[PDB]
Design a protein around this ligand. Structure first.
Ligand SMILES: [Cl-]
Ligand SMILES: [Cl-]
Ligand SMILES: [Mn+2]
Ligand SMILES: [Mn+2]
Ligand SMILES: [Mn+2]
Ligand SMILES: [Mn+2]
Lengths: 145, 142
């Protein structure tokens, strides 16, 4: 019979699958740039085509998560409706600019890595801008205009 | 070029890479819902912010590689193109030999046969990926 995914090992395996598939697409597109520079177009093309595979895998994991009423792997927020999706976006961006990247920057400065700290501070300011743009979308959706 | 091995900053770059990787995937997935419902401005914003998260993820990988750290996904070096392909092979190999078969068996045990069939499809897919990368690596070393 049909069962709730909530609290199951399968729910956790969909989450972990999503994380790994997300990383695989980013990794393969980064590796493709090195193949591009070095003159390996067949290798770059394969990396890019396999990366599209990993997009399909990630999106299918999110399909089962959303259809199963499970939460966003990144934020533990529901992602059933577009409004919920934007609220998930806002929650993650808010965590990143208010807590995560400032904390990473402080640790980098304290460990003697000022260039890395500056990068984390650039990202904190970027995620704040993202949060603001998503907040404006949510106003448009929630207000129905 | 400063060595990051054994630091909390090394761990933070890894976690930042994971988060940025997920953000790009999430925002492109959300854009498809905006597409279906007729919100092209919202879809376009999601796609443009997703490009931001690509830039963030790649910059984390630059610091990882320049700081003597390993690939977040595989714990393998990714300095050279050959090392990058060997990292791809290692992660594909883990997924087809172990990770997705294991997920499929658990899904069938827990009574999720449709999810199990999906995991079985993915195990076969990652095996094909591993083989295609192996054919590349042989060409590079040759
Ligand atoms: Cl080539
Ligand atoms: Cl719109
Ligand atoms: Mn995959
Ligand atoms: Mn962001
Ligand atoms: Mn980001
Ligand atoms: Mn793969």
């Amino acid at each position: 019979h049909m069962k709730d995914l909530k609290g199951t090992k399968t729910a956790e395996n969909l989450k972990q699958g999503f994380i790994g598939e997300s990383m695989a697409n980013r990794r393969y597109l980064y590796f493709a740039k090195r193949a591009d520079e070095e003159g390996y177009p067949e290798i770059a093309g394969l990396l890019r085509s396999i990366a599209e595979g990993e997009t399909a895998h990630a999106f299918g994991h999110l399909d089962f998560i959303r259809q199963g009423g499970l939460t966003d792997p990144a934020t533990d927020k529901p992602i059933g409706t577009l409004e919920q999706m934007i609220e998930s976006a806002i929650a993650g961006e808010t965590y990143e600019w208010t807590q995560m990247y400032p904390g990473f920057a402080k640790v980098a400065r304290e460990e003697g890595f000022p260039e890395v700290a500056e990068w984390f501070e650039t990202l904190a300011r970027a995620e704040k801008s993202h949060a603001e743009k998503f907040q404006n979308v949510l106003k448009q959706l929630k207000g129905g205009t």
